[PDB]
Amino acid sequence: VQFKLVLVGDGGTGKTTFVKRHLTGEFEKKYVATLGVEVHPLVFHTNRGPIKFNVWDTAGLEKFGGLRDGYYIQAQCAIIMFDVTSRVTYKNVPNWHRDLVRVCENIPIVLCGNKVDIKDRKVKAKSIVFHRKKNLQYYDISAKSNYNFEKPFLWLARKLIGDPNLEFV
Amino acid sequence: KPTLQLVYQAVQALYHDPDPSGKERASFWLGELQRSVHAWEISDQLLQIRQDVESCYFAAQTMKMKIQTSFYELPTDSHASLRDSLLTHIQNLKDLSPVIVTQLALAIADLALQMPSWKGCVQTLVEKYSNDVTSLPFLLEILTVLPEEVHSRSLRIGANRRTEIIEDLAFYSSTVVSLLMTCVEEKMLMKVFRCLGSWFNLGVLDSNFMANNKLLALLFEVLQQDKTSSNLHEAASDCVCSALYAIENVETNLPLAMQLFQGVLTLETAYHMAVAREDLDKVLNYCRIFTELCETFLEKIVCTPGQGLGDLRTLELLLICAGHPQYEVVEISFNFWYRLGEHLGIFKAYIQRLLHALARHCQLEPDHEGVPEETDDFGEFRMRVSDLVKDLIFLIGSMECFAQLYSTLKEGNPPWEVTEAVLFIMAAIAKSVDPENNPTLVEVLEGVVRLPETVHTAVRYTSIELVGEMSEVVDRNPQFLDPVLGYLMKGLCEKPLASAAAKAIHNICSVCRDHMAQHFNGLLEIARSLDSFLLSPEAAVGLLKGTALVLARLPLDKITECLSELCSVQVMALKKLDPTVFLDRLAVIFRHTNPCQKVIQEIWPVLSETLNKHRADNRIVERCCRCLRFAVRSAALLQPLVTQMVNVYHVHQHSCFLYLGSILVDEYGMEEGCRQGLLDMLQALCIPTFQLLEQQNGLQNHPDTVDDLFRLATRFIQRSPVTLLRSQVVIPILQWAIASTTLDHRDANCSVMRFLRDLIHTGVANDHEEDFELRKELIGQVMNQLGQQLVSQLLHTCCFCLPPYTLPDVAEVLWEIMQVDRPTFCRWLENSLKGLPTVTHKQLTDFHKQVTSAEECKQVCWALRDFTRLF
Numbered sequence A: 001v002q003f004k005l006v007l008v009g010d011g012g013t014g015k016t017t018f019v020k021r022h023l024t025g026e027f028e029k030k031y032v033a034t035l036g037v038e039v040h041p042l043v044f045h046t047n048r049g050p051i052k053f054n055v056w057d058t059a060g061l062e063k064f065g066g067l068r069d070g071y072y073i074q075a076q077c078a079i080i081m082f083d084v085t086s087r088v089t090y091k092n093v094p095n096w097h098r099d100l101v102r103v104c105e106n107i108p109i110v111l112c113g114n115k116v117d118i119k120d121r122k123v124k125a126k127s128i129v130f131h132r133k134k135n136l137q138y139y140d141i142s143a144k145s146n147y148n149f150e151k152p153f154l155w156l157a158r159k160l161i162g163d164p165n166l167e168f169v
Numbered sequence B: 001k002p003t004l005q006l007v008y009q010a011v012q013a014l015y016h017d018p019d020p021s022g023k024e025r026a027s028f029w030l031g032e033l034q035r036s037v038h039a040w041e042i043s044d045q046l047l048q049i050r051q052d053v054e055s056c057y058f059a060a061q062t063m064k065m066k067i068q069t070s071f072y073e074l075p076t077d078s079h080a081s082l083r084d085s086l087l088t089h090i091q092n093l094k095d096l097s098p099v100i101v102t103q104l105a106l107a108i109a110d111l112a113l114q115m116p117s118w119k120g121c122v123q124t125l126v127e128k129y130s131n132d133v134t135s136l137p138f139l140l141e142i143l144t145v146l147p148e149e150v151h152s153r154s155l156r157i158g159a160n161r162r163t164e165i166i167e168d169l170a171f172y173s174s175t176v177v178s179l180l181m182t183c184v185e186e187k188m189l190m191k192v193f194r195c196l197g198s199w200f201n202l203g204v205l206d207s208n209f210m211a212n213n214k215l216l217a218l219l220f221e222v223l224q225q226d227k228t229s230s231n232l233h234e235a236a237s238d239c240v241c242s243a244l245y246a247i248e249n250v251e252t253n254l255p256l257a258m259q260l261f262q263g264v265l266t267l268e269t270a271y272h273m274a275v276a277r278e279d280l281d282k283v284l285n286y287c288r289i290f291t292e293l294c295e296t297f298l299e300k301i302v303c304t305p306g307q308g309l310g311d312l313r314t315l316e317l318l319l320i321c322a323g324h325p326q327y328e329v330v331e332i333s334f335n336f337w338y339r340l341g342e343h344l345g346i347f348k349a350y351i352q353r354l355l356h357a358l359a360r361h362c363q364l365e366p367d368h369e370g371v372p373e374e375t376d377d378f379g380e381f382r383m384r385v386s387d388l389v390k391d392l393i394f395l396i397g398s399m400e401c402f403a404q405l406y407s408t409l410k411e412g413n414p415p416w417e418v419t420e421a422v423l424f425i426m427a428a429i430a431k432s433v434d435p436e437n438n439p440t441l442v443e444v445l446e447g448v449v450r451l452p453e454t455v456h457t458a459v460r461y462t463s464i465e466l467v468g469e470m471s472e473v474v475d476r477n478p479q480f481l482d483p484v485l486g487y488l489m490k491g492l493c494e495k496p497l498a499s500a501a502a503k504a505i506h507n508i509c510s511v512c513r514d515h516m517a518q519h520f521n522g523l524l525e526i527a528r529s530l531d532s533f534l535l536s537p538e539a540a541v542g543l544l545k546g547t548a549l550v551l552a553r554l555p556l557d558k559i560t561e562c563l564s565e566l567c568s569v570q571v572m573a574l575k576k577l578d579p580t581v582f583l584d585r586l587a588v589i590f591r592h593t594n595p596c597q598k599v600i601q602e603i604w605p606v607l608s609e610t611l612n613k614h615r616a617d618n619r620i621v622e623r624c625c626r627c628l629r630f631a632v633r634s635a636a637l638l639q640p641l642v643t644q645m646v647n648v649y650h651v652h653q654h655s656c657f658l659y660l661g662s663i664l665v666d667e668y669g670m671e672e673g674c675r676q677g678l679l680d681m682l683q684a685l686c687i688p689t690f691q692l693l694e695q696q697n698g699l700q701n702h703p704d705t706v707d708d709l710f711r712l713a714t715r716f717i718q719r720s721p722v723t724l725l726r727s728q729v730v731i732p733i734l735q736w737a738i739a740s741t742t743l744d745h746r747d748a749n750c751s752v753m754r755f756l757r758d759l760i761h762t763g764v765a766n767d768h769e770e771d772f773e774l775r776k777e778l779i780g781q782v783m784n785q786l787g788q789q790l791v792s793q794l795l796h797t798c799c800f801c802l803p804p805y806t807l808p809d810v811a812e813v814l815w816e817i818m819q820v821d822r823p824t825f826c827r828w829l830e831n832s833l834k835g836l837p838t839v840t841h842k843q844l845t846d847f848h849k850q851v852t853s854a855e856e857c858k859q860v861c862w863a864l865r866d867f868t869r870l871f
């Protein structure tokens, strides 16, 4: 039971750091730009059997874009990552969304506001309009403090499988 | 160029090989293929061969990605031939996967936007395919994405050429609208609306023409018919919202405005039809249309209410939506409400109607067992409600609403879930309510304390939070302090109520510290057995913080006595011995006990052992250093700490030792008795530091170390600069600083740009004092030696290494360099501009002129900005 998950968003927003949190359990301070794409199978044990996510961690930096759109084929779900501490990253969220729906239409897409741990927030959770529509959802997350760091996958699982009751174990 | 057999092979791996390590490698080879010159020829062939869906998407996408990035490497003559290819390709593959049709559509649009020799492209495309019914689906797809691509960051069309584009489309906006009518005469229907909506969003459609046009009528038509599918519905809604948004001035677009206003009002019936059924998808769309409608005609509702455009059925439609049992429906309208309140008597009744609607949305399920959880989806919603109420409460009156909410909590024998929800909204506003009218305020508090223990847990919980929000009323009415505390004392002793109580107690302690001295006896006794109440770490810390805030206000005599008791329980527990929690509890006590060194002596020995036991564990050490930081916040600790710091750091390079070091320098750096010892610490700390950064990827792997090292250096350069400048260690610091300029880690880079700025500025700042000439010479030496290497490094990072957000920090450093020696800098900059790998000599020249001739720092940043774009 596996799903192709494309992870998109501006560079330095915390995409790869977020994955490493799940993959190894280790929070990583360093910032190493992803080259093109980086595939990581993430397996979560649930109360209804194991679920594997084939996470496609794409690059945010224009120089290391890789195939960009080419990575999107046959995606079943996606996570759009932006920085809570960076206004310019949230401004680009519409363009990322537009790119996905031009390749993958009506797939479950989660908006993720990362680095909510930061003292001075520059993007208010109130102003977000993404979760107001359905098929779309938002979660305040933090790869450092692990705040709601499992929410996006659990939500996507409930959408991909189709069971609201489903829980992680 | 690679063989055709190889790319078909690499594609099947990338799309079917389950292994991650292999899938990445195929990706990279295909990646290098797109960047290469061979990409054009291969892609064109793949689409002609059309083996399968996988390879055709890649070729079409590559076609698009090569047109929007590598358009420059095409001879003018090739343009016409490439266009014929893409149009032939999209023809042949028109019934293939839709995801392939889009990419080709995108490619043609991106091509057209960059091809001025293809004038009247809108006209060309339509009259070639409009009559073929099977051509229509991809023609529309191109027509939809074309206006969207005009603001493409991937294309980044010049400002003048972009303006030409938009007005060129406006010219032909008639032709596509005309076409869009022929088109609709379900799958096809929604394609039409999306296309219509897209041209609306560009703001190039004629309001007056669209005002009287069948397309508009068709929009509201399908939005009225109950039989219409979910997909046609969403498309129609989105197009309506696009129509409304495109209206910037209602007056200039009055024909269109009136048509749309009347149109959406006819949907109220369709709304009721959708809510009669369980069609939640449809109602969310209607609620979106309504909220968008009120935003557009907000001005008319305000200026001439009730009359025409100001027809108050608009606000009513929202209050109906507000009444909906599904909470995902009402939050859609929250932003308008914010905006309505923001612009703001006629509305008052509407806002108070809304508040009652939100009050009921906060009602928990009658079978709810525990406390209201904040983490879940619904607890988040309650907060969004709480925040919205705070911002609108001024339209009712914080005295009017607070009293009114409380009054309705005795009539009709209110069930527990109705009480909790009313208490919740009261707590939301309990802070903003003016404590002038105390009687109505102070009687609410008396009501909450007389609540029996028998009431539902969740009612006890929210009432504790309400009391917590009412700390200003306990400050103005000190008699209620003892009853309030006692009530909170009961909640603290109940496990699921503990955290809420501890938080509420802390609020009281902070505001009512002036006369809290009596109760301190109790607070200490809570601390003495803190881990019995099953508290959260946050609630625990917050509790100890409170008692420490009032201890500082106690009589000086009893302070030293009670402080030692507060810490002894912690010390004895550590002595018995993961110490993190007690380290964190010690730290907060010190942090807010600000009326001490007598107690510090008792603490130091157990901390040193704790630090040394877990000297390998960064997380514990980090909490350890935080603790030690606040204890200082006492020269008897200095040397035994510095020694231990250096010794631990020697084997475990915890960067928090650097930061802790920076604190000692910030606090004792001005004391010339310490200046030598502090410099020794720095020189000692730098040795294991440089060892870390000397390693491969040393800067990338320890950005935390880079950040904290230069915070230390910065504290030095602003507390005792001369001590650092005459030292020998300042030279490798500066070198690493210069090396650190290419570190893309944002936090660490701000710190580095900060040290360089503050360092160079020392040769300029405060020329009024005597030692200025010494500092002037020391920097002059430094600038002589390294000045040319810094400027070259700074210029390098701006153009190739770091993201645009660093520019103001670099510009600030560059500015200080000109303050030290501008004529020399003018020479330096020419060398930096000399070594560059394109960019015309004219551009380098006028860049040099702007920067070197800058009179404000602002001018340097813009100068860097424009030049940086070139790379």
Ligand SMILES: Nc1nc2c(ncn2[C@@H]2O[C@H](COP(=O)(O)OP(=O)(O)OP(=O)(O)O)[C@@H](O)[C@H]2O)c(=O)[nH]1
Pocket: A010, A011, A012, A013, A014, A015, A016, A017, A018, A028, A029, A030, A031, A032, A033, A034, A058, A059, A060, A061, A081, A114, A115, A116, A117, A118, A141, A142, A143, A144, A145
């Ligand atoms: N405070 C805080 N910092 C974070 C958090 N998550 C990530 N960061 C920082 O942000 C950086 C994220 O690096 P990456 O995840 O590799 O960047 P990215 O999102 O993958 O962007 P690309 O590399 O272009 O794909 C890390 O170096 C962290 O220092 C967080 O939750 N809290």
Ligand SMILES: [Mg+2]
Pocket: A015, A016, A017, A032, A033, A034, A057, A058, A059
């Ligand atoms: Mg990455």
